[PDB]
Structure formats: structure tokens, C-alpha cells
Amino acid sequence: MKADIHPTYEAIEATCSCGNVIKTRSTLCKPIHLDVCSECHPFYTGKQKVLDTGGRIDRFKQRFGVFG
Amino acid sequence: RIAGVNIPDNKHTVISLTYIYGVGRTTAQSICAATGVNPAAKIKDLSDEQIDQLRNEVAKITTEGDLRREINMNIKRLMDLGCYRGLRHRRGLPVRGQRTKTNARTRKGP
Amino acid sequence: RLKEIYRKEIAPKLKEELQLANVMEVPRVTKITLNMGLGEAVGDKKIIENAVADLEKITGQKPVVTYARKSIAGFKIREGWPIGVKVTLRSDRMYEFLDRLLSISLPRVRDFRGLNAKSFDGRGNYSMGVKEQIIFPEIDYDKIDALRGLDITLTTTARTDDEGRALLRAFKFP
RNA sequence: ACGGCCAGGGCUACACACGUGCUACAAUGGUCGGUACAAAGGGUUGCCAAGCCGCGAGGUGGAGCUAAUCCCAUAAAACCGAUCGUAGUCCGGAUCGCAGUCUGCAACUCGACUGCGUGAAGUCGGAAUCGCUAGUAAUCGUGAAUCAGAAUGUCACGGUG
RNA sequence: GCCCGGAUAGCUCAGUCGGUAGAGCAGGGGAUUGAAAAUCCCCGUGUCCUUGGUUCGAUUCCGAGUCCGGGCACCA
RNA sequence: UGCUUGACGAUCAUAGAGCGUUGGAACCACCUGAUCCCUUCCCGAACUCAGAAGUGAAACGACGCAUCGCCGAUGGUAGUGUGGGGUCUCCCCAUGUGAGAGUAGGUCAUCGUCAAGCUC
RNA sequence: UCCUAAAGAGUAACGGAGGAGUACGAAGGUGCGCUCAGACCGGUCGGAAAUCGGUCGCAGAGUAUAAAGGCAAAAGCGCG
Ligand SMILES: [Mg+2]
Ligand SMILES: [Mg+2]
Ligand SMILES: [Mg+2]
Ligand SMILES: [Mg+2]
């Protein structure tokens, strides 16, 4: 590694909203918290769900009973 | 990333949340009333503590990346069925029943 | 440090997982190359330095500007000779930059899926594209210009892409 | 049958050009919360109050009423305090997706409104061209004729000027 | 038979020293006008005769092939 | 009077390309961190350095396996020097020479000097 | 520069095809390091294609300049 070429590459702390503290070595030179991390994203938490496809049948039965 | 998308600064909370693309003006007022954030203060003056609550509120209505997907799927449901409402939609004519003889220029350009 | 997680957990696990003979036959990540494509604004002579500065901060390493080897008249003339900016990262920087991926750069695609598992080379090299340059530590939003086409190209010591999938799913981000 | 009765559809089609009319493009303004004053008219085959449940359009309810009595019915602009700081924006509302109420045997072609989301063109507009000499032009409301429902046109009178 | 010039919008002419196509008439739309013209405002148009190369790139550079013009086709 | 391996060569596909099992005894890279030299149009993989904490497979090292490539006969034919002819834009005769292509099939090459290991 | 030119040179025609009347102060000298063209897979606004990674390659690229003859001691490419 050349000496006077690269920026300052120091160690900082990445803290998420849930409190997941990650020791990351970056060029930041300061600690900055994050709003979402790998453990809080809906896709990797399993909360992404689906677009629900279509429910007109359901909707019609919820809307109109139509006895008989 | 800030709340799902980048939010402007030097503006009130309700106006700032309007750019979330899925919360308008009235629902933004309800989110602020539920959370407790005062709209009178700028988003700059707010702390980084209740923004998690604002994100939780955003995560219970919709996000734009899925709102556009599902509204496009709703359009597709009409477009793949044979209905007249989609028949005019594909060609780009007015859908709700506006007059087509003249001045249907928003859906056809210059 | 992902190196300590890899040596202790992934390395002994993959040997018995893939029916490998000895310790060192396991696949490993060879290098990470980013290759921010500066094709837009060929005859500018003003965005090359901005792209170099932007890529310098998110990697902790000065990139190298890449010239052309031909001239697509449909694309642009040779007058704008510098077109590309490239970075290479080996183990000292690779495992530390890879921590941003799978830990804090998973909230970086604004996506429904982290990364498609059907995109692999015949030998087992993985590639991925990052749409926005906003997604990184120590980067402003007002001072940054939103014209940055960044890729993340991965190289692995795999004979075939199934070994690449087996290695990737350990530090999984699909 | 160029005469009649019944179903649907059509007159509200749509690269285009023209006349009239309403919205805007904002800071002499946009929202929020207080507070002041009208004229004229319609209502026993009708007006349809109070309480009441609904985010709202509204649903129940049935009073008083045949009219200085009761209802339609809260006039709005202005004025007082806060914020917005001129930014394609707390401007602009078209467009579209979802969810409803009312009328009607019946709201797809093809109705009017209410709730959430989306947010366009538009930064005062060429040659040209029009209305107006005083409660005039300009701007803001109210109620009615046709009417099961349906107005930016149109019926009628008033605020500031 | 031989030699020189040219091929550009619907029509007439500029153009390049290769990266780019304009002027006028004509045409369309709107204003004038009782109506048509002439006044006025706005607007769309060429794939640069065809072909083969040179090139990253050809209307432009080069060699051929058509069409239209101008010179000569002489001593017997 | 053996096998393994390193260096430089003779000769350049009968010496090449492709398909297994393997070598721990030195090399072969790989590797710890790149501190001390040196290096990156940015990279400790290229290059360099303290070895061996590790590793024997990817990598290479030779060591199996004749599909492809390469070599290629004999014979005939084409061609041709000399001399003479015909039906003379072509061919023939006497004599001498004589291809290319095609046609059974071999091969995982054959060797020179130095240095090291296996037994002691 | 190639053919005509007949396997040493040379060899004509108003014979068949092409170029030159220059460029470089680094486009020269030296030391040290590196592969070309082309095919395929993957990779966000590019997509048959730009920049990047990998494999197959085994010079079919490149030569400052027309064609011929050569270029892995590369005669090609970069740095001091
Ligand atoms: Mg009515
Ligand atoms: Mg000769
Ligand atoms: Mg000779
Ligand atoms: Mg040279």
C-alpha cells in the first residue's frame, strides 16, 4: 500500500435502531448510527410478504352477502 | 434510507413526510398526531430518537416501491380481463368517462 | 472481521458439505472489483475527478481511471479518452469492504430481493449492480451528484457456479 | 309501412382546427384557530329541525309548519393571532388505483358527490382581438327555474369596490 | 469514340476541407377580409443519384455504374 | 549399476492437444502479517522480503490412457531436361528424372553436463 | 510494393493492381515489467455492443504511414 495515496482508514462503530453494534473499519473517522441493518430489513426478517395478488372473490363476499 | 426515501430539510414535519410517496397531507397529520412529533418544529430540530417511530408508522401504510407495483398490478387486472375501462386505458383515452371529442389532451400530449 | 468468521466456521463446514477431500480445496473469494462506469458525459472533463473522489471514499483506496481501446461512433468519439474508473480489493480490504455488504448495504438496493441467485458465470464468478451512490458511509446527499453507475463484481476460486452458490449462501445476501 | 309496440346500442366516439365558459400559474397570497354584517326566493303530495351514530358524503329520528311564527340557512370576501419565505412550492388541481353514500327496476358504455394515495401541463401567455364611462369594471357569496339524480352554462339578489 | 462540370427538401441554389445541412419559393395551421389574394405569426420536410472501399465515423475522401450539360471527334 | 527431483541445453508437433491415480523428500506455489529493502498507470495474486505457524488438492511436477493433430511409405499420375514426330491454341514417342493428394499404420518422444534425495 | 518474371540477379509493352514529394525532442537510446484479435456467461438508466470479472484462446490483432516480406531475443504495450 502506497503511503500518501489512500485516505485515512480508521475504526468506527455502526449502531442500528435496534442497537446492533457493528465494529467496521472505514474512512468515516466518526461513528454514525443507521436506521436499518441486515437484521432489521423486512426481506431478511421475513416481513416482506407478497403483493396479495387479487381477491375479488373475497371482496365480493365481504361486500355483498347474497343469501341463497 | 432516511425514511424509505430522502427527505428534505428546513421544512415542517407534515410537509417533509408528504414526499414519502404514499402519505399525503391528511395521513401525515394523523401520523404526527399518533407519534407526538410537533409539526411546528423543523425536521432539523427533531432528535434522532422518534424517527424510528416515524419509520414504523411509514411501515404500516405503504412504501412507494410496492405501491407502484401493486397499483400497476391493479391496472394489469383490468388490462388482462377485456373490460372497457382497460380497453380505453391501453389506447390512452380517458377512463372515467370524460369527453373525447376535444380537450382530452392530458392523456395524449401536445 | 469476516475473515475470522470464514476461517472458523465456513472453511471447516464447506469441506464436509461439498464432499471435498482436504482442507484447502474449499472455494474462497478471490477479489472484488467495482468498476464504476463513467460512460455518460464523455466529452466533459469535469465528472471524472468527481467520480474518482466519490469512489475513493467508499473504498478507502484511490481508484484508477480507465481509457478506451476502440471507438464506437454510435457511443462516442475517442476525444473523451477516459471512460472508466476501476478499483481492486484483495484480502486486507476485501473482507472489510464485504462487511458493508450483508450487514449495512443490504439497506442499499431499495429492493424486493437482495440479489438474484440466477446471475453467475460458467466458472462461478458473481456480479451485481448498485443503482445509487447515496448508499455508503461518509457521503453527503446535498454535495453528492446522483450520476454514479457502480457495479460490484466478485471473483471466486470455484470450478462451477454451484460451489459459488454454496460459498455465497454462508455470508448470504440473496 | 316513410305508420305503430318492446329490448339493447347511439346522440357524451376522436391524430385534428374553431367559439364561449371555469380553474389556475401564487406572498395585494396558501393553510390552521377564533369572530361581523346581507338581500331575494322555496316549502301541508313539501320543507324535513333537535338529539343521535359516522374521518366525511350521510343514516336514524320525528318536531314545528301552511307562514314576520317552523325549516331551507352556516352567507363569503374583510377584520384578529400563528406558520409558510416565492421553491414547479403547505401553488395548481387534471389524471389514475382502492373504498363508499344518495337517487333511480336499473350508475359498464353513461351520473353527482364523499374518504385515502398519485401527482401532470401551467412561471401571465405571438400575429391579432374583445367588454366596460359609476354602485360601472374587478372580485366573493347566497337562493331558484328545468329537475327521481345530475351545472363551470343559465334563473335572481346582495357584500368590498 | 475521348475529355471536363453537376446530381442537396415538392422546386431553385448555398454548403463542407470528415463528427453540422441552410436561403428563397412551395406546403400545413392560426389571424386578417363580408369572401379570395397580398399584408402578419408559428410549424414540418432532405436519408445529399446508385454502388465498393478508407476509416471509430462519409453528402464531404477514393474507384466504378446511371442520368443531365459543356468541349472535341482533326490531315487525307 | 536403480527410482525421484532442480538447473541449463541437443532437436523442434513420430517431441503436440485431451481424457485418471498421485509425490512429503528436498523443490512447487499457497500462507501469518507486510513490520525491515522493494512493489502497485489503484492491488503483497504480478515484484520483493523474515520462513514453513500451516497446506498437498486448485496450481504446477513428472507419471496412465492413441480420439484429434503431426509423420508417411511402395505403386501410379501430373510435370520436366535432351532428341524426333502428329490431327501442332494441344499431345505422343526414345531416354533420364519425377512430384502434390490419397493409400496399412507409430507415438504419452530420444539424448548431454552439473546438483540433491532415497540405503549408508 | 506485388504480378507478368519462366523456383539465383535482370528482363519490355499506351500490360494488370496500389502509394510517396511526410511525420516523431518522443513515435530515438538504455534498464525493468505485460499480453493480442475474436467467442461465451454474469453485471443498475448503456446493451449486438462503452467500463468490469471469468473462461475458451494458442497472433485469425498491432506496426505512424500504400502493398510485400518479417516480428515469444516479440520489432507490440507501460514505467524510471
Ligand atoms: Mg335538480
Ligand atoms: Mg527471378
Ligand atoms: Mg528463371
Ligand atoms: Mg516501434
XYZ file of C-alpha atoms in Angstrom, chain B residues 13-75:
63
model
C -42.688 17.600 9.629
C -46.014 17.254 7.792
C -44.640 18.781 4.589
C -41.470 16.693 4.905
C -43.467 13.455 5.221
C -45.528 14.355 2.134
C -42.526 13.424 -0.046
C -42.645 9.804 1.201
C -44.795 8.959 -1.864
C -47.684 7.185 -0.179
C -48.550 9.597 2.642
C -50.299 12.803 1.615
C -51.301 15.758 3.793
C -54.111 14.337 5.939
C -52.457 10.990 6.699
C -49.222 12.808 7.542
C -51.183 14.803 10.125
C -52.556 11.569 11.605
C -49.061 10.057 11.817
C -47.812 13.152 13.646
C -50.819 13.137 15.991
C -50.269 9.465 16.837
C -46.497 9.725 17.314
C -46.394 13.082 19.141
C -43.958 14.954 16.873
C -44.826 18.638 16.683
C -45.210 19.819 13.048
C -44.283 23.368 14.119
C -40.637 22.328 14.545
C -38.424 21.681 11.546
C -37.126 18.190 10.829
C -33.643 19.574 11.524
C -34.657 20.457 15.095
C -36.019 16.950 15.706
C -33.984 14.334 17.553
C -32.813 11.034 16.078
C -34.890 9.104 18.656
C -38.506 9.271 17.407
C -37.552 8.875 13.737
C -37.685 5.120 14.377
C -41.330 5.605 15.368
C -41.878 7.637 12.195
C -40.341 4.785 10.183
C -42.593 2.285 11.981
C -45.606 4.407 11.032
C -44.358 4.512 7.433
C -44.014 0.702 7.561
C -47.768 0.274 8.254
C -49.332 2.164 5.302
C -47.191 1.546 2.204
C -43.824 2.252 0.592
C -43.549 3.602 -2.958
C -41.572 0.633 -4.288
C -44.526 -1.658 -3.534
C -47.298 0.914 -4.026
C -46.304 1.353 -7.664
C -46.014 -2.426 -8.047
C -49.496 -3.076 -6.654
C -51.204 -0.191 -8.460
C -49.602 -1.438 -11.695
C -50.949 -4.901 -10.875
C -54.397 -3.383 -10.298
C -54.143 -1.761 -13.736
